[PDB]
Amino acid sequence: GITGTWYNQLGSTFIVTAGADGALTGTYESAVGNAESRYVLTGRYDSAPATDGSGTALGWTVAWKNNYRNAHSATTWSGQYVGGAEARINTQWLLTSGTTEANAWKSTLVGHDTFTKVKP
Amino acid sequence: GITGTWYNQLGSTFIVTAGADGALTGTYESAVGNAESRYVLTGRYDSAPATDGSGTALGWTVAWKNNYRNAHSATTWSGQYVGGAEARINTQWLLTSGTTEANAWKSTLVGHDTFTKVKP
Amino acid sequence: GITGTWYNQLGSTFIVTAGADGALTGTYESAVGNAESRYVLTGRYDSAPATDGSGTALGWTVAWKNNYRNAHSATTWSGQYVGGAEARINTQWLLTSGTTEANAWKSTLVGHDTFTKVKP
Amino acid sequence: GITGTWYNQLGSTFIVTAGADGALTGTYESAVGNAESRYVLTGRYDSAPATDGSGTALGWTVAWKNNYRNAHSATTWSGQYVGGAEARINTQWLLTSGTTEANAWKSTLVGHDTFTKVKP
Ligand SMILES: COC(=O)c1cncc(-c2cc3c(=O)[nH]ccc3o2)c1
Ligand SMILES: COC(=O)c1cncc(-c2cc3c(=O)[nH]ccc3o2)c1
Ligand SMILES: O=S([O-])[O-]
Ligand SMILES: O=S([O-])[O-]
Ligand SMILES: O=S([O-])[O-]
Ligand SMILES: O=S([O-])[O-]
Ligand SMILES: O=S([O-])[O-]
Ligand SMILES: O=S([O-])[O-]
Ligand SMILES: O=S([O-])[O-]
């Protein structure tokens, strides 16, 4: 299932629990950027997915503030869990930094992360 | 400045509480605001933003399942809160639907939402 | 139609010609209007759109190199032209900068530009 | 290193010439290799990239109209070319369909393609 410890292609660590109420809760540790140790995450997932072979839709957010550092930014991952020989969560993400209005055009990075239960 | 009710450009409404712990909790719904249009939201925000005039980074997720409906999808909004005389939350979003692998190319919509404290 | 001089919400100037073959050609520049901030663009558009009221899909690219400056980056805009008494081109864009592999996570900005034939 | 034939990870091919003026021209074949599935592409690239291990920024567009078919849509790919023994073009894409204003929310898909010089 979704609950577990996952790693993305850069070796970030995503520790998540899927609640029966559709909640995702856990911690995220980033292999990149202005980040140190674990950050709180929260999200949601479809707790009654289609039974037709489709993946399970989900998303979560990390705001990049913890007790050590504050990057004044937040990442949301939107994606789906794909059950499988090798279970995977395939996502695309948006990383918005707090900016002045003049710099808002350059506030948001986009990318795609794939997570499995094995570290690269 | 974030806690309360916000309205997007399209008719949607959300009500959120910004907790002291950096949490965002609430519900997302339609203009009409009927029970069947209401979904849990959860997210995170920067609870200690920069003091140089930058916005406040935040993000949240809604999975489009409630006790009545299930669209097998989830949206994440990633953006920033701008305070001042015309307060706004400016976002970009990713809506991922659960798909088969063959259809994963058409799984993810992208767009933008601007939220205000007053109705459009 | 599409051929003409457009401006985005930030004052950039998009001078484009829509050819009979689906080609878009022209130049993209900044508000100041100077040679050093002017760049070549090329793209494509649907030369036979639907007749049901839908917009006309289009996209184009600017590589941020000209005879004076090189930012080692390129932007693509993807969107549609909406006809009527206020013609508009609504777009989302991706701006990729050349990076090392280690920095590829932070290579791509995303945003949205709306273009009209009037200045903002 | 850009000019030539490239293959994505899902059975598409394209064929591009990278002109000394920074033009990309060519054809994109959504399948392999029937003419009903071939479309014009044009774009731009950084014709003077860094030789510091950074990728070469580029982008291109395909409008999904040819002599056989018309999906009333256009994709733009934004990315970077990475040279060497195992050369790649790493992209993120936006696929916008022409829509009515009421449907504009669901107009734009996002995703990622990775192209290699060898077939997958
Ligand atoms: C009541 O159920 C729905 O209407 C519904 C179903 N599926 C998706 C959405 C929806 C609403 C919404 C938005 O306000 N901004 C960005 C994406 C987005 O998606 C709404
Ligand atoms: C690395 O980026 C640059 O150096 C650069 C230089 N000069 C203009 C622009 C630019 C302009 C622009 C716009 O109007 N919409 C969307 C993206 C975008 O990027 C970018
Ligand atoms: O991943 S954010 O800390 O730069
Ligand atoms: O690098 S973004 O996945 O936080
Ligand atoms: O995750 S994309 O920035 O290579
Ligand atoms: O939210 S953008 O797809 O019109
Ligand atoms: O404000 S959006 O164009 O980064
Ligand atoms: O045309 S998009 O599915 O790479
Ligand atoms: O699988 S990503 O290209 O939607």
Task: Describe the overall structure.
Helices cover 0% and strands 57% of the residues of chain A. Chain A has 120 residues and is an all-beta fold. Chain A has no helices and 8 strands. Chain A has strands at 4-8, 13-18, 23-29, 38-45, 56-65, 70-82, 88-97, 108-116. Chain A has an 8-stranded antiparallel beta barrel. In chain A, a hairpin with a 5-residue loop joins strand 6 (70-82) and strand 7. The two termini of chain A are 20 Å apart. Chain A has one domain (1-120): Lipocalin (Beta Barrel). The A-D interface holds A 92, 110-112 and D 92, 110-112. One sulfite ion is lined by residues 104-105, 107-108 of chain A. One sulfite ion binds at residues 30, 32-35, 64, 71, 73 of chain A. Chains A, B, C, D: One of its GO terms (cellular component) is extracellular region. Chains A, B, C, D: This is Streptavidin. Chains A, B, C, D: Residues 1-120 form the Avidin-like domain.
Within the CATH hierarchy, at the fold level, what is the topology of chain A?
Lipocalin
Main pleated sheet of chain A: 8 strands, antiparallel, barrel
Radius of gyration of chain A: 15 Å
Strand element count of chain A = 8
The CATH architecture of chain A comes to Beta Barrel
Alpha-beta content class of chain A = mainly beta
Q: Number of domains in the coordinates of chain A?
A: 1
- Proportion of residues in extended strands of chain A: over 45%
**Which kinds of small molecule does this entry bind, naming each only once?**
ligand 6FX, sulfite ion
Largest interface: C-D, 55 and 56 residues
Distance between the termini of chain A: 20 Å
| Strand ordering within the main sheet of chain A | 1-2-3-4-5-6-7-8
**Under the CATH scheme, which class of chain A?**
Mainly Beta
Counting copies of identical and different chains, the oligomeric state is homotetramer
Number of helical segments with 4 or more residues of chain A: 0
Domain Avidin-like (chains A, B, C, D): 1-120
Motif (Cell attachment site) (chains A, B, C, D): 44-46
GO molecular function (chains A, B, C, D): biotin binding
Organism (chains A, B, C, D): Streptomyces avidinii
